[PDB]
Amino acid sequence: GPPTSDDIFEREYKYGAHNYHPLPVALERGKGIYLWDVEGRKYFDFLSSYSAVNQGHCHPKIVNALKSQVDKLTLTSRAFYNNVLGEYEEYITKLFNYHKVLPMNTGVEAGETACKLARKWGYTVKGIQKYKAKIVFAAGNFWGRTLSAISSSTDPTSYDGFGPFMPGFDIIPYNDLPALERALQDPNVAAFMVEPIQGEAGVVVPDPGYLMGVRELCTRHQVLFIADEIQTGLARTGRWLAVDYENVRPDIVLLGKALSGGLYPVSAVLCDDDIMLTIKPGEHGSTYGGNPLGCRVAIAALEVLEEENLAENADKLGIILRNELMKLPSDVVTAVRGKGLLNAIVIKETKDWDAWKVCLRLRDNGLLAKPTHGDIIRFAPPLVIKEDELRESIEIINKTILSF
Amino acid sequence: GPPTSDDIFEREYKYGAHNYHPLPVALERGKGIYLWDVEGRKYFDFLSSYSAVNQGHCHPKIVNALKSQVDKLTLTSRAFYNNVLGEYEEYITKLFNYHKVLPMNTGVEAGETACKLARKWGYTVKGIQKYKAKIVFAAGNFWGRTLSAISSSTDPTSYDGFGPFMPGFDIIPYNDLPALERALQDPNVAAFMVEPIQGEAGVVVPDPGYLMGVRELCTRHQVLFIADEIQTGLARTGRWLAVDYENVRPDIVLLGKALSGGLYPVSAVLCDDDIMLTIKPGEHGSTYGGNPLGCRVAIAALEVLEEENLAENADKLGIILRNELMKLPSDVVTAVRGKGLLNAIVIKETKDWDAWKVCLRLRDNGLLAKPTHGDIIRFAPPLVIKEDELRESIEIINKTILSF
Amino acid sequence: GPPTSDDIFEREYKYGAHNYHPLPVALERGKGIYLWDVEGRKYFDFLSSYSAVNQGHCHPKIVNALKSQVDKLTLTSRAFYNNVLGEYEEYITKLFNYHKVLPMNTGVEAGETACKLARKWGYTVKGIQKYKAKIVFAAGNFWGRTLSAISSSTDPTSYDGFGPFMPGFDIIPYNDLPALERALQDPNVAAFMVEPIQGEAGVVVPDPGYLMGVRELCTRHQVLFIADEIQTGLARTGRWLAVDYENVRPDIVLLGKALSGGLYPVSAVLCDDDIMLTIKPGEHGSTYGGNPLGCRVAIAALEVLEEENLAENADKLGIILRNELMKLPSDVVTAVRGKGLLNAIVIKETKDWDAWKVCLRLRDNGLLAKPTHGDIIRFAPPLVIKEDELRESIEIINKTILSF
Amino acid sequence: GPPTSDDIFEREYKYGAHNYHPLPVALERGKGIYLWDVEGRKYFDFLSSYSAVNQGHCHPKIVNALKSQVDKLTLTSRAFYNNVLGEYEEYITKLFNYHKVLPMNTGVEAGETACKLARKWGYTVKGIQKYKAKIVFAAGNFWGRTLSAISSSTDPTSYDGFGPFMPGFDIIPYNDLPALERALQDPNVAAFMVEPIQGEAGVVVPDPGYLMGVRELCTRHQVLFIADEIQTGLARTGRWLAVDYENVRPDIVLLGKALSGGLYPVSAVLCDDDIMLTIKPGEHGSTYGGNPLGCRVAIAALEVLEEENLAENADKLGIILRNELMKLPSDVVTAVRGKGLLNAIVIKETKDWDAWKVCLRLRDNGLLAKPTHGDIIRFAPPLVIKEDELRESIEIINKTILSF
Numbered sequence A, B, C, D: 001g002p003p004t005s006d007d008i009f010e011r012e013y014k015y016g017a018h019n020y021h022p023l024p025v026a027l028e029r030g031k032g033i034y035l036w037d038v039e040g041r042k043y044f045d046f047l048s049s050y051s052a053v054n055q056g057h058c059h060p061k062i063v064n065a066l067k068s069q070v071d072k073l074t075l076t077s078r079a080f081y082n083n084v085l086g087e088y089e090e091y092i093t094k095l096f097n098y099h100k101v102l103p104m105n106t107g108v109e110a111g112e113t114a115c116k117l118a119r120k121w122g123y124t125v126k127g128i129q130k131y132k133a134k135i136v137f138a139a140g141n142f143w144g145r146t147l148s149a150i151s152s153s154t155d156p157t158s159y160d161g162f163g164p165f166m167p168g169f170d171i172i173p174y175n176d177l178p179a180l181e182r183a184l185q186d187p188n189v190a191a192f193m194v195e196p197i198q199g200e201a202g203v204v205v206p207d208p209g210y211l212m213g214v215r216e217l218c219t220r221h222q223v224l225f226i227a228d229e230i231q232t233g234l235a236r237t238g239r240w241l242a243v244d245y246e247n248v249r250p251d252i253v254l255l256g257k258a259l260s261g262g263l264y265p266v267s268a269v270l271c272d273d274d275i276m277l278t279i280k281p282g283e284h285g286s287t288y289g290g291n292p293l294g295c296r297v298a299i300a301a302l303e304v305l306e307e308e309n310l311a312e313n314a315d316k317l318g319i320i321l322r323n324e325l326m327k328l329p330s331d332v333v334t335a336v337r338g339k340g341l342l343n344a345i346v347i348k349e350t351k352d353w354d355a356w357k358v359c360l361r362l363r364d365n366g367l368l369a370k371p372t373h374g375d376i377i378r379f380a381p382p383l384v385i386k387e388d389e390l391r392e393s394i395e396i397i398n399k400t401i402l403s404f
């Protein structure tokens, strides 16, 4: 017969690498804000696949876009043209107001591209001597798992045992303008890459004005501001871009995850011509980047975001979420943070009570979430959720937390 | 109305990065070995999207697996389990006979994963001091476009302007056993990564015995043999793996491209437990890696190769293709090479006549191919091609080549 | 009676090491451009003993310098002074415009001296920690047969079976500025050694601008540029130094071979005081280095080059040689290369027709040459050759090549 | 007018490397046992250019061989054959009773050749894994100035500032059988290289039985015995080889210096076929190695040694030299050592009295010698010296020593 949840776990343990320790639940179906395991149980998805399913699981318009194109053409490679990519390019460039886009597949690939653009611009336009270009990052950052990405990490779990590391990556504290200004005194700095809110660090929101101050500093020192909006972008924090809260226009914007509604790995690197065109024909690419199938699903996923006004929903509903979460006792729940529907709670962890235990019980009470250390729990349900559904999940969260 | 080819070209020129200089052709449909442009012209695909559509464009079995899964569940993320991953992991591990697989999305991600495993094994099993581990590569190698992949490249178009480069990567000549023997004298070498046939270098085929000598030397010096079969694998050269020609078992095998039949970016890293399990939970991953949608399509993609015996077909037809191409005048076509359906011709390039010009005329005569330098043309049609179709293509190639 | 050519080969086979497989011809006399075998046959010498007899075999002025000095004093050793060395030192240093010269005997000794100068300069002036100094070399280099020289070689015949190898020697492709620039990012690099034209690799001429770019990159990164002109120097390429074609002044210049006209093993290392004086008294030397007999002959050898304007002749006649060689069919002779009178042709080798076979027939037709793999033949006659003699030799080459 | 001794020093100081600090004397002529400076002064040569002029300066027979051959042919290179080399090979190999000879030019080149033979023999015959072969050397050794030669030296002046060093070279004390026996327990050792009497270390004579014990231990443990007789060979110690005193037959014998009588840099490597033939055609060589001019002079140089029974004379006169030297006061001259005409004295050095100062006074009194630290003076006149001349020189030494 059909495998049980336990059969499912055992099979992966035997045949798959052990690079993850997932919360013990086996999903076979997803729709909107819901997930169903193989035993048929129903669950509120409060992780949204890291924002990839902002539009909810299997959104019918994005599904139909995928189904329509797969019968026509799925991959020509960029050795030749296809009819779809240019339409997606004009669309996303006009939506975000940048001259061009460089299509890639995964979040880390957008970051790598952005680092390559930063260096190439650094050498060919800023006049940095090869190869003395530096890129500054903020401590707590997370942009992927390539050798380059773990080389800017301050998390031992990311870099330990994987060295030597990529040179020319400097790290400074996040939410620290004076540190940034100090780093930018070196003219060999080509760029500063930062998340408007750090996702994996535990939904760390920098103080008001941080983003405006980063922009000012980058512009003064002729440094590219690379904003990684792979998790924060596409309506999840209440705007098209988290950077929009302070009216900031980064030099390079990275998008991924919700860009395809979870139907295909699609990522994007947006920037104007003076940066974008430092990379010449033949100097950068990817087998699947810009394929017609991912473009069709991306056009659809962006249209859902716009047409269903999900940014406004996430902003209004996020206020409720945070307001209800702050009612929990301050001796149980230490802090509440986030923007829009990108939130987290910090608990007063003890040797016998932790975030993992809380998520296990949440699971038991029908809500799926993942801990981000011993003391942090993220709450980020799909943006299609309704206030009634949200209030029901808040009750589940309340009941569970108070049940310890 | 509908954009013309010229309109398609222009739109991408304005809104897309110029990292590619494609052959000027605009496709809107693909099926099997054929592609159709927006003007309705029909062409033989002799590029197969860099060997990602080995199964032919839009294979019905693969399309059906995608349509079936997209209605159910596409991405839970690795924070939770999905019912499909394990079924795929057991299938692919038994097919290639390795304990485990680590699922990723793009070719370069598989290579990054292999480098991280090599290093982690190097430090935690072999005993190399952190962080002195080295990874040896062959000149001409191409494993992608991340900062780390271009740091091992000998092609300036890949690395120039993109440094500083990742330390710990050494380069030796390809197809050179004495040179590998010399490099492996350093006890700090953790692995040697190599393609059984170099693709982007110009379909460079090493001499008979090279692979056995690499396996022998790596074993002798306690060095992992990493075979990048992202382009050579999955029946392209006439075998499940190009290393099968010498019956050699690498320590780590990389798969990508045709692993999905061109319908989704799926890549994979296969190896036994002693290497795979050096990476503990939380130390490596990817948002889309191992998602259920990509797994369903990869199972179907692998089934097609098997069920249709595409390896045998590529082997049988590849010899016909090469023997026919060798009949061209040795003063116009300087060399013919390849294995199975992964082939190239070298032309006697002049200032007035080159590979690009030949490919434009080939396009005009109904066959799509892409030059690998001013003198090399790659011929790699989907493996579902039939003998009569191959001979038709051959006539097109002879006609074009002799027309100058 | 006197030994026959065949007795000469047999005797060497029995009593001498088998470290060479020379073209079967036994010479007993040489004068100018010609050589005679023991059977009395006359041959044009188109190898010139690798440039050692640039001045032709047994030039009367050099011979007379030899005879004059051997009646006076031949070797005092460096424990004392000889009256001749200083005169040769002042002469050669003013000729090439460097502060000093360090006299050695063979070409590999001057290379070894240059490596020791570069390391000493690296530690004592550049500040590199002992013993982390690196020297970069170009693939295809040849600078002799010591353990250190074969350690930088990429030719398996030079290094296979002779290791372990000297550490601190790194190799990059020849004629590759991006690769040199990449290598010189390591501040532990003390020098880059390179031949302006690679001799033994098959007369490989780098592209216009390579030397200038080498000079620029070395100066920019505080690395010593060591130019090995042992084969290319002293008028053979059409100038005093092959680097003069680009007005490039290397940090260290190595000379040998023609420096004595073939009458005595004489080599020289030229550089300014900031480099030369890093080596103190008792820290480097050679028993025969700077002996009075070799100095007298070197003074005369250089005087012949200057007095007879051999560089101008080699330039003028080299143009003629290459122009006539290019008239040979492109389906037989694939390439013609060189500068001045250092040239070579590449033939369309088959299993039954090769460079060795061509050189046997050449010998049969009165011209002696050295094949340098299965498809390269070098053409480098003494620089004292006249246009009529050159044209006569060219007809012998035409006759031979066309005769197959 | 002609340069004065002082002008000669000044000129070299300005235009030549400062790699030596010679005794201030400028010679312009040499005949037999004598040398004349530019001021006309006559001196007894008690260094003999480190044994290169064993036959005396400018021996008429060697000079005549030189003059005869320079009118015929001086260098064809090894790309072809010359009629002279084979004649010299048969001559020298029968003289020393070894199958073959490998001709080189300088002493360090023959040592380098012997290391390469030992490694090649080690891997191809002994079975050592590539590249684990070791070569053992004796502390105090001196065999030249290449990077490899200074890597086995225990003299800081030879190696300091010139590293990193050649691996695989191990050092044990000289004249120490227990230490050699201990080193040869490693089966990865391929050879032991040693001087029968250390020259540059200060004429260090090992104890009776050392050579026999070296021979025995090397045979017992399947290790090659390489005897460096470049300074001690060719009659200087009173025998053809210093190893003849113990009837020991080394596996490899190196010769040089006197092999040419000081007229040409000529060196030789002798061994039987099982060793010599481990090196195949194209695997080792030298441009000037085995040239016809050096062979003619080497044949004559050896003939003079044999014909004039110089070994017998050196033996007889060496007894006299040492017996007279031992009459000097023990509180001034601490030791007298040597064999045949290779001798030295050790003096009771103080802060104000040293070997250099003694050698200055010697020069003042008409005898030239080389000090070899602050307390050693070597006495080694040409082997053509007569008893009356020796006794005259001895009085000059007595006079000088006693004069302080």
Ligand SMILES: Cc1ncc(COP(=O)(O)O)c(/C=C/C(O)=C/C[C@H](N)C(=O)O)c1O
Pocket: A050, A106, A107, A108, A109, A111, A142, A143, A144, A145, A195, A199, A200, A228, A230, A231, A256, B078, B284, B285, B286, B287, B288
């Ligand atoms: C801000 C930001 N920027 C880039 C990335 C990399 O995204 P991708 O996984 O598609 O390469 C991410 C990815 C987050 C992510 O995948 C979290 C967990 C992930 N499964 C892991 O390997 O630990 C991101 O949050």
Ligand SMILES: Cc1ncc(COP(=O)(O)O)c(/C=C/C(O)=C/C[C@H](N)C(=O)O)c1O
Pocket: A078, A079, A282, A284, A285, A286, A287, A288, B050, B106, B107, B108, B109, B111, B142, B143, B144, B145, B195, B199, B200, B228, B229, B230, B231, B232, B256, B257
């Ligand atoms: C042997 C091998 N290993 C890895 C890769 C990288 O695969 P991916 O493109 O999915 O990152 C490839 C990919 C090659 C490829 O597609 C090169 C051309 C590509 N259009 C580019 O410009 O990057 C490969 O040939």
Ligand SMILES: Cc1ncc(COP(=O)(O)O)c(/C=C/C(O)=C/C[C@H](N)C(=O)O)c1O
Pocket: C077, C078, C079, C284, C285, C286, C287, C288, D050, D106, D107, D108, D109, D111, D142, D143, D144, D145, D195, D199, D200, D228, D229, D230, D231, D256
């Ligand atoms: C036992 C032995 N074996 C080899 C050699 C090296 O010989 P050559 O200098 O020709 O490379 C020597 C050379 C000794 C010698 O006198 C070298 C002194 C010379 N003036 C110098 O600094 O190199 C030797 O004594």
Ligand SMILES: Cc1ncc(COP(=O)(O)O)c(/C=C/C(O)=C/C[C@H](N)C(=O)O)c1O
Pocket: C050, C106, C107, C108, C109, C111, C142, C143, C144, C145, C195, C199, C200, C228, C229, C230, C231, C256, D077, D078, D079, D284, D285, D286, D287, D288
């Ligand atoms: C650019 C360059 N630099 C140095 C050397 C070495 O020179 P020598 O042979 O005198 O050590 C060479 C020598 C080349 C050459 O012809 C050596 C051939 C010689 N018959 C052998 O096997 O060693 C050179 O081409």
